Ligand binder design. Structure first.
Ligand SMILES: *[C@@H]1O[C@H](CO)[C@@H](O)[C@H](O)[C@H]1NC(C)=O
Ligand SMILES: *[C@@H]1O[C@H](CO)[C@@H](O)[C@H](O)[C@H]1NC(C)=O
Ligand SMILES: *[C@@H]1O[C@H](CO)[C@@H](O)[C@H](O)[C@H]1NC(C)=O
Ligand SMILES: *[C@@H]1O[C@H](CO)[C@@H](O)[C@H](O)[C@H]1NC(C)=O
Ligand SMILES: *[C@@H]1O[C@H](CO)[C@@H](O)[C@H](O)[C@H]1NC(C)=O
Ligand SMILES: *[C@@H]1O[C@H](CO)[C@@H](O)[C@H](O)[C@H]1NC(C)=O
Lengths: 403, 68, 184
C-alpha cells in the first residue's frame, strides 16, 4: 500500500534593487565637499558600477528563474480533470490579483539618499507565468518544454509518471479514486499547514530582515562623529577654522566611505548568495517541474512524480508530490528457479513466496502472477547459482497445442 | 521614483518618463525599465511588456497528440 | 588610474613632496597617500576575489556540464540544450569553453483518439511500452514520441484485472498469432 503526500520547500529568487546617491550620502550642499571628493581619484564610480551590475544580476535572476517558456498557456474551461481537485493550485479569475488561494495566503502571511528601485517584474506577470507553467504541466504533460505542446489527458499522464519509477501502470486504474482522494486530502492538509505553522516561512523573512537591517545601519552610521569634532556639515564647516576643518571633514568622509564600502561588500556577498540560490532554483525549475527527475532527494523525500510551483514575494515556493510506500509484508525469496536442469531469472522483478507457492512480482508493489516463460529468461545451467530452489514453471499455451 | 508635479509626459510606476509617449498596444520588451514597462524605438514609445502569444491548447477526456 | 590621485595631499608624486617640503609634514602627506593607496588596493583585492567567486562557480557548473552531457548521455530535461538530449561537443575557447548541443525537437504533430485499455474476452489489455491510438475506425499502438502504428498483439500487451474495475475502457479485438498458426 502506498501513501501520496505533498512536501513543501521554499527557495529565494531575488531581492529589491538598490541605488545609493553617492555624493549625497557622503555630504550634501557643500562646494568644499565637491572639491575634496573629486580629488580622490575614484571611490564612487566602482560602487555605482557594482551596484548597477548587481541590480542587472537580480533582474536576470528574475528572468531565468521564472521565464522558461515563450508561450502563455491558458487552462481549459472544464474543471473536471478526472476527479482531481485542482482548485487551490489553479488560479481563479474571481480574485482581483488573479492569484491562487495558496499564493494569496502566503502573500498575506509574508510581511538619507538611499533609493530602492522597483523590480522589472512585479507580482502580476509572475502570477501569470505560474498559471502558464501549471497549464503546461497539467493539460500538456511534460512534453511541452521540449518542442511544441501536445494534448495529454491527466490520468494516462499519471500512469506514465508511475511508469517512470519502475511501477507498472495497471496499479493506477484499479485505485484511481483512492489516489484522487489521497491527493485532495494532502492538498487540504498542506493548505491548512501553510497557515497553521508560523515557522514554515523563515529565510525569506530573515533575508528581508537582513536587507532592512543593512539599509538601516547605513543611516545609523550616517550620524556618527567618526572621531571628528562633530557629525553635522553646517556645524563643522562654519564654526571651525578651515585649516583644521578641512582635515576634520576629510576624516569624517573617510569614515563614511569606509562604512559605505563595507556595506557594498556585504551587499555583494549577499547578492552572490542570492545568485547561487537562484541558480539552484532554476535547476529545480528545469528538472523537478519540466519533466520527471529520477534521482532521490532531488525532487522530494521519496520517489518524485511531479511538482507545482507557486508565485512568492521575492522568491518561489515548491509543492512536490512524492510516492511513499508503506504497509510492509515479510516474504521468502530466491535468486533463481531451478527447472529441468536449467535456471530461470526474473525479467522485471523478483520471485516472491509466501508459503509453499512461488510468484513473480514487481519491485515496488505486490502483484502476484504465475511464473511463466514470457517474463523469464534462461541462462546457464542449475549447478552454479547459490541459493536456487526447485520449482516448476508454467508453460504458456499448453492446453492449446494438443486441443 | 519622482512624482513630476513640479518639474509628452507619461507617468509610470517608477517615477516620471519624459520624451516617450504611451501606446496601449503591447510588444516584446527590449529596454527594461521597471513595473512592467519596456520602451523601444519603433520615435520612441513606451508599452506594456508582452508575455508571449496566448497559445491556448484544447483539452478533453480522450484526446491525445503524437508527433509524426 | 589611482596613482594620479592627490588623496588630500599637495601632490601625487613622492619625489615632489620629499624634495619640496620638510620631513615632519611630508610624513603626514606620505601617510595619507599610503593609506589611500592601501584602501584602493584592498578594494581591488576584494573585487578580484568576488570575481574569483563567480568564476569558480561558473567553472564548477561548466565542469559538471562537461562531465555529464559531454562524457555521457544526460536524461535530465532542459539541462544541455532546448529539447531532448542527443549529443553535444566541446570547442576550445580563450578563457572559457563553448558547448555544441544537439537537440531533438518532435514538431509537426497530429492528434488522435486514445483509450487506457482494451477489453476482450472479459479481461483488460495494457501496453507494455506504447499507448493505444485510434484514428477513427481501427485501433493501433504506437510509440510515445513517434507515430509508427502497429496492430494490437498479445506479444506487446499484458493483461491484468478485469473489465469492470478500470474506467474508460473500449471494446476491440486483439490479434493472437497462435490462432492462424495452429490451423496451418
Ligand atoms: C491502503 O489502505 C487504505 C486504508 O488505509 C485503503 O483505503 C486503500 O485502498 C489501500 N490501498 C492499497 C494499495 O492497498
Ligand atoms: C475543489 O473543491 C472545491 C470545494 O469547494 C471546489 O470549490 C473546487 O471547484 C474544486 N476544484 C476542482 C478542480 O476539483
Ligand atoms: C500463498 O499465496 C497464494 C496466493 O495468494 C495461495 O494460493 C497460498 O495458499 C498461500 N500460501 C499459504 C501458505 O497460505
Ligand atoms: C503625484 O501627485 C499628483 C497630485 O497629487 C497625483 O495626481 C499623481 O497621481 C501623483 N503621482 C504619483 C507618482 O504618485
Ligand atoms: C469530461 O468529463 C467532464 C465531467 O464529466 C465533462 O464535463 C466533459 O464534457 C467531458 N469531456 C469529454 C471529452 O468527454
Ligand atoms: C485509419 O488507419 C487505418 C490503417 O492505416 C486505415 O485503414 C483507415 O482507413 C484509417 N481511417 C481513417 C478514418 O483515416
Amino acid at each position: 500500500n502506498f501513501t501520496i503526500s505533498v512536501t513543501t520547500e521554499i527557495l529565494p529568487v531575488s531581492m529589491t534593487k538598490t541605488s545609493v546617491d553617492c555624493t549625497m550620502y557622503i555630504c550634501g550642499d557643500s562646494t568644499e565637499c565637491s572639491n575634496l571628493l573629486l580629488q580622490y581619484g575614484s571611490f564612487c564610480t566602482q560602487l555605482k558600477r557594482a551596484l548597477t551590475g548587481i541590480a542587472v544580476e537580480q533582474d536576470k535572476n528574475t528572468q531565468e528563474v521564472f521565464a522558461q517558456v515563450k508561450q502563455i498557456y491558458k487552462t481549459p474551461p472544464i474543471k473536471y480533470f478526472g476527479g482531481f481537485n485542482f482548485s487551490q493550485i489553479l488560479p481563479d479569475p474571481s480574485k482581483p490579483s488573479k492569484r491562487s488561494p495558496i499564493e494569496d495566503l502566503l502573500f498575506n502571511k509574508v510581511t538619507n539618499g538611499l533609493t530602492v528601485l522597483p523590480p522589472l517584474l512585479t507580482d502580476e506577470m509572475i502570477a501569470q507565468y505560474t498559471s502558464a507553467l501549471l497549464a503546461g504541466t497539467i493539460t500538456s504533460g511534460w512534453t511541452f518544454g521540449a518542442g511544441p505542446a501536445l494534448q495529454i489527458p491527466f490520468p494516462m499522464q499519471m500512469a506514465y509518471r508511475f511508469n517512470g519509477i519502475g511501477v507498472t501502470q495497471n496499479v493506477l486504474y484499479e485505485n484511481q479514486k483512492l489516489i484522487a482522494n489521497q491527493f485532495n486530502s494532502a492538498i487540504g492538509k498542506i493548505q491548512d499547514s501553510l497557515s497553521s505553522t508560523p515557522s514554515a516561512l523563515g529565510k525569506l523573512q530573515d533575508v528581508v530582515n537582513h536587507n532592512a537591517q543593512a539599509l538601516n545601519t547605513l543611516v545609523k552610521q550616517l550620524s556618527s562623529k567618526f572621531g571628528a569634532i562633530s557629525s553635522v556639515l553646517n556645524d563643522i564647516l562654519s564654526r571651525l577654522d578651515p585649516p583644521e576643518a578641512e582635515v576634520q571633514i576629510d576624516r569624517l568622509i573617510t569614515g563614511r566611505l569606509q562604512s559605505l564600502q563595507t556595506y557594498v561588500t556585504q551587499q555583494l556577498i549577499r547578492a552572490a548568495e542570492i545568485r547561487a540560490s537562484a541558480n539552484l532554483a532554476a535547476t529545480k525549475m528545469s528538472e523537478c517541474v519540466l519533466g520527471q527527475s529520477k534521482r532521490v532527494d532531488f525532487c522530494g523525500k521519496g520517489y518524485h512524480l511531479m511538482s507545482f510551483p507557486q508565485s512568492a514575494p521575492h522568491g518561489v515556493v515548491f509543492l512536490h508530490v512524492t510516492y511513499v510506500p508503506a504497509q510492509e509484508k515479510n516474504f521468502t525469496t530466491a535468486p533463481a528457479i531451478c527447472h529441468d536442469g536449467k535456471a530461470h531469472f526474473p525479467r522485471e522483478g523478483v520471485f516472491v513466496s509466501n508459503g509453499t507457492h512461488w510468484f513473480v512480482t514487481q519491485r515496488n508493489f505486490y502483484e502476484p502472477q504465475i511464473i511463466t516463460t514470457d517474463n523469464t529468461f534462461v541462462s546457464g545451467n542449475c549447478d552454479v547459482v547459490i541459493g536456487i530452489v526447485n520449482n516448476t514453471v508454467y508453460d504458456p499455451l499448453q492446453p492449446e497445442l494438443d486441443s | 521614483g519622482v512624482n513630476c508635479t513640479e518639474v509628452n509626459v507619461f507617468q509610470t510606476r517608477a517615477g516620471c518618463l519624459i520624451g516617450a509617449e504611451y501606446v496601449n498596444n503591447s510588444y516584446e520588451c527590449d529596454i527594461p525599465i521597471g513595473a512592467g514597462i519596456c520602451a523601444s524605438y519603433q520615435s520612441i514609445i513606451a508599452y506594456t511588456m508582452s508575455l508571449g502569444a496566448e497559445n491556448s491548447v484544447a483539452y478533453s477526456n480522450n484526446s491525445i497528440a503524437i508527433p509524426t
